[PDB]
Design a protein around this nucleic acid. Sequence first.
DNA 1: GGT
DNA 2: AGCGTCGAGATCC
DNA 3: TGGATCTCGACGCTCTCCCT
DNA 4: AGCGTCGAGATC
DNA 5: GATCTCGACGCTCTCCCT
Lengths: 530, 530
Amino acid sequence: SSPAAWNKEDFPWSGKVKDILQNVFKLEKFRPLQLETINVTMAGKEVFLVMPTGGGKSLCYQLPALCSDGFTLVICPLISLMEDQLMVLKQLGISATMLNASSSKEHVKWVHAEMVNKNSELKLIYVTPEKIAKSKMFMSRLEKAYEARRFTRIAVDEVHCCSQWGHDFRPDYKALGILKRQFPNASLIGLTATATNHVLTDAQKILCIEKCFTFTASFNRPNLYYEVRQKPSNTEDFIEDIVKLINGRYKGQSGIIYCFSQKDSEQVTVSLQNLGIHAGAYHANLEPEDKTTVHRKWSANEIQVVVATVAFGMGIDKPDVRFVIHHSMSKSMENYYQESGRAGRDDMKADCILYYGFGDIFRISSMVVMENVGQQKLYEMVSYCQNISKCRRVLMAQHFDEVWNSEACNKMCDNCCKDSAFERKNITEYCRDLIKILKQAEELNEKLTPLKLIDSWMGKGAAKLRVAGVVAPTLPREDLEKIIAHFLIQQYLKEDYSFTAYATISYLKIGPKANLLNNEAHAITMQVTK
Amino acid sequence: SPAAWNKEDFPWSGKVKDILQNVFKLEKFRPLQLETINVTMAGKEVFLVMPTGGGKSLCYQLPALCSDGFTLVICPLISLMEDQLMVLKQLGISATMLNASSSKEHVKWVHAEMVNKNSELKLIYVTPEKIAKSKMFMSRLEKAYEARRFTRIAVDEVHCCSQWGHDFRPDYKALGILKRQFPNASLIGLTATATNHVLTDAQKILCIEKCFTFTASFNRPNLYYEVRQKPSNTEDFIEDIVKLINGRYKGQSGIIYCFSQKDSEQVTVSLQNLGIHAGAYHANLEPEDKTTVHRKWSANEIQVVVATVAFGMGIDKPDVRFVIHHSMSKSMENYYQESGRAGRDDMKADCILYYGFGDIFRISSMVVMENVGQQKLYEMVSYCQNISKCRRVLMAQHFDEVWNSEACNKMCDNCCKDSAFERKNITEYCRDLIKILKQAEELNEKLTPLKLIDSWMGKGAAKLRVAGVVAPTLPREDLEKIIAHFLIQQYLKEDYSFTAYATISYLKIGPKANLLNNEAHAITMQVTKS
DNA sequence: GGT
DNA sequence: AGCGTCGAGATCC
DNA sequence: TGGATCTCGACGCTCTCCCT
DNA sequence: AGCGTCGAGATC
DNA sequence: GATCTCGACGCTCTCCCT
Ligand SMILES: [Zn+2]
Ligand SMILES: [Zn+2]
């Protein structure tokens, strides 16, 4: 677990290695962890690498495949993912191919031939797992190649699928223990961007390995600027704001906007189009043509902006994305990190801006009602939006359990650039008033949505639901909203779901921690600007 | 502990005794039945672990008749549901089910009877996607719960909730929604197979606390257990089977289990040619064929079914008098569940298993991609090699149960034997085999098990013999048993090879062999005295 | 098809 | 089901 | 007996991520 | 590929 | 007169929806 120990260049192979980097791949130096990994593989050992998408993983196997003689075998879960790499490879003059569930009796026959063939130019073969489990023909081929010593290294992609917990399970993966058992003299390397330590140590068993190196890279992206803003109440106003940025500071530049639904995705698109902006829509119910065309024009810069759901994500590698804007919040902290992380892959400065709105809490809540920890992960994301003083990088590192040193931000988030001071406001009596309202409602046999509770507080809405003697304070509507959100994640209040013919809806009720207000000396405070 | 729950002095006890004798036509309770029913009527949560045929379903079916209105049942397979409706119908009790393939007329009537205030309906079966994906179905349960027409829930195959379940079905991960939305109903979980790990997992997922756990014993006092030598010649094997079936079993129903689909059909043809009434069963017949066979066997128009593991689920014939194993099972858990289909009426019945050398290697190759396949096979081989321990004692070592050793009462073959024993020294035979294997590798040749026994015995191809070795004077079946011994103790080992149409086993020198370098090392095996 |  | 709009009538200054 | 503002039914429109 | 059968061709 | 050794020639090639 110590990479630095492996940070030299006095190994025999060091020469051809430096040679191949600059001459074949056209590069000057190494990004982090790359060198320490390559050394370990050339020393003939076993290693796992954990690093974020776009960090430089594939080079770690693609390169040593060129220092020995003959091919390297690569196992990959999806067809699209394989095609991406062959293209890059083809563009540098390197022969490699892939077999698959849908190849031709001719192609299939040509690969079988090139493996045994001791004079072939092949360097890399990509396959799927069912290929290892369900093909005696293919396995008998590997056997012969291994015995002539045409094949000495193996790489496994998405290695977190071995173990049950990985949250992506693919059964075919459990079979892969057969690799070290039948070819013990070859070295193995596993790759992934997402792994608990329990999950890793498990798969080391499934693959029948011992012993094992484990290198881990850091989450941090020094060139990205992080900001949260208030979402405007009126849709026509919100669309204007976004236009001022696109024709303003980002004019001429490429970006992405992320939405909540398929319908939101289309309606935003129509609106930018109607004001001369060059934009296109992307989601899972579109024809495969539409998808492929939109993705093509964006890469060629004939299109400035893609407006998308989470469907637009897997396998994106464009270097010059200058902005990423969030039209609604994400459903969890892990999802936001991976979505925003698509900006600035060229290492140059880029911006990440998120719009926060009260009504989105409840839209996402109902959508995730059957996930066992759905509501918990949502409330974590809500906490991050409510905060007006801690560094954004500090709040993220609490989620990933990295060891953060406080002042490494350098004025690259919104809270670190603020000039203000703060104080804690006492809001205990507001909580006692809301509970009066809820309590009257139940005697009357009525249920309240969030909208109806804010209305009664403010003295508006249907009259029977008001309570004599309560006075709603003199603040803007957005401040009242932020206060209610506070009581909710602290559990003084709670959600109560109902099932109807076409929808799941949320109501508000008295929560479990409301018993604390029995001490008449108990106090609830929230932070504000002076 | 259940002990505390074994009475009849609670307010319900009367109607309960009433309903057992008058509605279900029964005298007294089988083990654990009473203690479970009490706990459910006391409004609590409980898990029940008990073998198939033990009396589980009665534990929910009955209390469904003491309250008012229906009980909801969740079940993974359509066939399993149909079995139970048939029984309930014959009793005079109303019930129904809902499916992926139901008519719109039927679906309507059901939604109607759930809310309907005077419904005769008593039990309702559904699958787990009805709960996870139907919006209309959930809104129906909601109304029923509020009128108090529905207060108990049972979940079948409860072990599927979990990843370790060895039977996983993903829709199960949505069932936490039941206690969350209906906190006043009681829940009961059912299963025949569970680690204490698997159970604690499912009690989280279902969002429960706290929880009773009752466990029944594996033991079946009426079954007689035996192991016999399988004859080399196949014309000879068919004869003994017939001596039994015309002899002690004449006129009695039984089952015979086979290794392959092809074995299944030959054996059948051989019995028919000698006047036995027999039929074949495996996954590769038409849906129609299957049913017509299962039907004639139940009506006693057919004496014997010859089958693969495909023939198991749904089986409930009370009067199965014999179960014979044509080849061994692949694991101890499989044998237990297969043989356990005999004697469901509590009357005496027989279980006989035929052991053969060549079957070890047939099974080995078939399970090559399961990560613990070879391990589980060698456990089953150990049990066949033993000539002195009680069969019940060897089984209880596998289930981690608390057996006291004289409880068998002369109901297995080893407990009826009259013999005495001694430890034969076989160290020099091991040294000789290794010589043979060592010569073979110099010559660049690989040996199957058949080829090794031949060279030992002085037969086979001549270049593979070793000068100075003398094959003992013993029968072949004894030589086979000795080689099996060195294999599980790991003086030898298996080495697999992949070919165009087959996976095959070879034998090679194994690890524990190094120990033959001390001149003080001794290997012994147990035998009967002259 | 949601008193 | 929830919520936005339109109009008639009943309350305010 | 003027001009603004509250209150309440009747009515029509709308109803949620990703192949894992 | 492994294993079984058959008949010419050298040694019991 | 009855057992031994070697090519050549032909046939066969595996459990359940989970
Ligand atoms: Zn900062
Ligand atoms: Zn016994």
